[PDB]
Coordinates of C-alpha atoms and ligand atoms in Angstrom, one line a residue:
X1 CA -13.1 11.1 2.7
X2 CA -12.4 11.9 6.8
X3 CA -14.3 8.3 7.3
X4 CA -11.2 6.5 5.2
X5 CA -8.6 8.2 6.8
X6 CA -6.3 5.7 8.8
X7 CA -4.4 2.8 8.5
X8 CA -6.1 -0.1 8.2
X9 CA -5.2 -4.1 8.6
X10 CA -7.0 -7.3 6.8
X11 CA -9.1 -9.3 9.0
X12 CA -10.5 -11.5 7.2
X13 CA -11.0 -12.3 3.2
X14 CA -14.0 -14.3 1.3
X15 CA -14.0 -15.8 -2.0
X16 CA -11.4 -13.8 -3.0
X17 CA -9.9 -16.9 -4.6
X18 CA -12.3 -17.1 -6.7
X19 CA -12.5 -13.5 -7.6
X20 CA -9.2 -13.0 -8.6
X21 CA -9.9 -16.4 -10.8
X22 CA -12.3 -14.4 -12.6
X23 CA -10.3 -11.7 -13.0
X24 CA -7.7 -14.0 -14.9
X25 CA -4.8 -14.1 -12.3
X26 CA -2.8 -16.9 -12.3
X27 CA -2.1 -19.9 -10.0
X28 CA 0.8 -18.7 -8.3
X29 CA 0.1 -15.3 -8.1
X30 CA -2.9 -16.5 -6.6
X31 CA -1.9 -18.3 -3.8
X32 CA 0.7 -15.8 -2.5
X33 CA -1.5 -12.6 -3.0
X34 CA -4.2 -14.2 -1.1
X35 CA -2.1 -15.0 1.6
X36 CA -1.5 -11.3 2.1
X37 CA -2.5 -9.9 5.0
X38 CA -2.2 -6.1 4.0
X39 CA -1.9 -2.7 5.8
X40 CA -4.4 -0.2 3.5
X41 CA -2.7 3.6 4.5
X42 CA -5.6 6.3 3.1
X43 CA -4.7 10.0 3.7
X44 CA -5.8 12.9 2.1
X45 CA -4.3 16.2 0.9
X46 CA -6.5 18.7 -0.7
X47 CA -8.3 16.9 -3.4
X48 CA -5.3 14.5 -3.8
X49 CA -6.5 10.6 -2.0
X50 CA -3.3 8.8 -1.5
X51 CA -4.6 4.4 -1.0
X52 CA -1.3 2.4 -0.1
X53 CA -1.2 -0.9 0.3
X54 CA 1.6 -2.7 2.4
X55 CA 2.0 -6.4 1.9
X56 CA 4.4 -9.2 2.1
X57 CA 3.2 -10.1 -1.8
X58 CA 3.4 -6.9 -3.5
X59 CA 3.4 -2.7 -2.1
X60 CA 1.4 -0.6 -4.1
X61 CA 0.2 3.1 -3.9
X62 CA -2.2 5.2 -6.1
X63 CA -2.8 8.6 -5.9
X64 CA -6.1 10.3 -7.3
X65 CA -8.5 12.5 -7.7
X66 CA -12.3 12.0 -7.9
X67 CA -13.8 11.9 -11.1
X68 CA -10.6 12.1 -13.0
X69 CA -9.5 8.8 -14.8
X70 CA -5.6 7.6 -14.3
X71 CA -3.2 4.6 -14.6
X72 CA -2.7 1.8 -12.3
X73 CA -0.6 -1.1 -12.4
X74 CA -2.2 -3.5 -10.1
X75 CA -0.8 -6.3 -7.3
X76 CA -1.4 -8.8 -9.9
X77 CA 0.1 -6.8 -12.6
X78 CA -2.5 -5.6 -15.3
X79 CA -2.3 -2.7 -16.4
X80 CA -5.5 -0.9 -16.0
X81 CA -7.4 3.2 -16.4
X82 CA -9.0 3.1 -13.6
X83 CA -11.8 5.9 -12.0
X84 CA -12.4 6.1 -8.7
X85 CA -15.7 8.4 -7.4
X86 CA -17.4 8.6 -4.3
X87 CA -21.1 7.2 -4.5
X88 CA -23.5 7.8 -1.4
X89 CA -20.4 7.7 0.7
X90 CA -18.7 4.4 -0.9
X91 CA -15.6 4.7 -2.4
X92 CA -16.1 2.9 -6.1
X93 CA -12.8 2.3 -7.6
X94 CA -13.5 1.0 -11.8
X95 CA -10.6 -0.8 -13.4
X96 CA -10.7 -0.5 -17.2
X97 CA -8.8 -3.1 -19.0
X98 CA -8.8 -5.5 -22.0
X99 CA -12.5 -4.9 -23.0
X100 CA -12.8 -6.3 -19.0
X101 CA -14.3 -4.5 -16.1
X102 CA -14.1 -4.7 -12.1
X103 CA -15.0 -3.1 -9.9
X104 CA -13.7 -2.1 -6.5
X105 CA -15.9 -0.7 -3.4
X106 CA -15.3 0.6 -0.1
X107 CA -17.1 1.4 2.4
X108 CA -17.5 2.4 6.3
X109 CA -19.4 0.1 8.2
X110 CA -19.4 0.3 12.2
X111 CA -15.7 0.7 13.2
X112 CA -14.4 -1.8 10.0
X113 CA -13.7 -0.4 6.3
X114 CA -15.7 -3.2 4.2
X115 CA -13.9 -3.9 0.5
X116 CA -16.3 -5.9 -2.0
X117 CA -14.6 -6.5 -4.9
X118 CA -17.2 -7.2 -8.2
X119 CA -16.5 -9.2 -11.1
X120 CA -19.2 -10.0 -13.0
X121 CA -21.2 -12.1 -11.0
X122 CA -18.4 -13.3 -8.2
X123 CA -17.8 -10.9 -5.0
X124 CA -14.8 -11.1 -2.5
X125 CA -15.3 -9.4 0.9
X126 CA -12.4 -8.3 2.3
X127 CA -12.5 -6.8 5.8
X128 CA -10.4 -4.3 7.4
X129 CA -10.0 -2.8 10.6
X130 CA -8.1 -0.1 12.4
X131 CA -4.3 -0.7 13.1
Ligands
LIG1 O1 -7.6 -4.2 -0.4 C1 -8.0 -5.4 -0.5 O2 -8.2 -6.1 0.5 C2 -8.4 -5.9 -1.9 F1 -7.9 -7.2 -2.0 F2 -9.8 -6.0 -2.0 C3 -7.9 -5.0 -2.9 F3 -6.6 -4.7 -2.7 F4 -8.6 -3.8 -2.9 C4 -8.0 -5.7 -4.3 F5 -8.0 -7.0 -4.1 F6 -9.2 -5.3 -4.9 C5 -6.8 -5.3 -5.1 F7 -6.7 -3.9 -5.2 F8 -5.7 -5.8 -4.6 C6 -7.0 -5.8 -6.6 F9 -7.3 -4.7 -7.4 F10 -8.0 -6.7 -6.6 C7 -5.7 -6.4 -7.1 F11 -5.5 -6.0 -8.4 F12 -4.7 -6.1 -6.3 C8 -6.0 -8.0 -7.1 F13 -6.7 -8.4 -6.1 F14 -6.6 -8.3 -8.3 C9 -4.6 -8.7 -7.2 F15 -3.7 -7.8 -7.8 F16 -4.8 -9.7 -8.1 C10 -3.9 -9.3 -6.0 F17 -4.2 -10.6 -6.0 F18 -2.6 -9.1 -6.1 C11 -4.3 -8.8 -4.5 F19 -4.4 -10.0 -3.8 F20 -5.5 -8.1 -4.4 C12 -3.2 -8.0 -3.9 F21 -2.0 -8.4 -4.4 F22 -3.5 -6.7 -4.1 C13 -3.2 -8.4 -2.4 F23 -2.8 -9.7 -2.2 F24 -4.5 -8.3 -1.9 C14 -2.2 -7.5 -1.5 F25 -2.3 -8.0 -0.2 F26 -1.0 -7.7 -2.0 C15 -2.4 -6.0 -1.5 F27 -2.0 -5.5 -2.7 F28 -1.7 -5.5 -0.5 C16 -3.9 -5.5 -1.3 F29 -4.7 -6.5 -0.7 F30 -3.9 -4.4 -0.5 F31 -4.5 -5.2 -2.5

């Protein structure tokens, strides 16, 4: 994952509004999460990948290893197994929960680390770039 490695800060967010509608977070969470504007810390240790998040809503850090299911307690506070495994070079992250699924993908494009986050049929772009 040398392409991840880095700390990384939001520039810009779509639709994730209505993404995290779909996901079933609610109103206030909502508005204060999407006004986030996060730092995203990826490092690497062996086979461990370590994904912080720093954010004026809510800090969170997971660390995992590819392939290999684990728990997560997200921003928004499900509590979710969650697989993360590295497809053609994207980073897809599956949150298990409820009977629901999302999913979470992240990728390398020119010098910005692209995050489309799936559910069902609704898609949030999120766009980082290097601190
Ligand atoms: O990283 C990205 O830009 C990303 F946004 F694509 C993402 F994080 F991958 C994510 F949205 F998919 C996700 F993981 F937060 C999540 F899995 F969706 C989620 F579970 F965190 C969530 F989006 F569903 C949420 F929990 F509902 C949320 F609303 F809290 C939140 F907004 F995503 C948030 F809280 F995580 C935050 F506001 F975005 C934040 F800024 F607090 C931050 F935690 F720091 C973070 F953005 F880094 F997540």
């Amino acid at each position: 994952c040398d392409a991840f490695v880095g700390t990384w800060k939001l520039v810009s967010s779509e639709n994730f509004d209505d993404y995290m509608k779909e996901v079933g977070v609610g109103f206030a969470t909502r508005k204060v999460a999407g006004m986030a504007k996060p730092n995203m810390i990826i490092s690497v240790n062996g086979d461990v990948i370590t994904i912080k998040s720093e954010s004026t809503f809510k800090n969170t850090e997971i660390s995992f290893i590819l392939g290999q299911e684990f728990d997560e307690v997200t921003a928004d506070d499900r509590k979710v197994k969650s697989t993360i495994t590295l497809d053609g070079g994207v980073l897809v992250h599956v949150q298990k929960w409820d009977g629901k699924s999302t999913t979470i993908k992240r990728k390398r494009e020119d010098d910005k680390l692209v995050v489309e986050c799936v559910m069902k049929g609704v898609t949030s772009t999120r766009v980082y770039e290097r601190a």
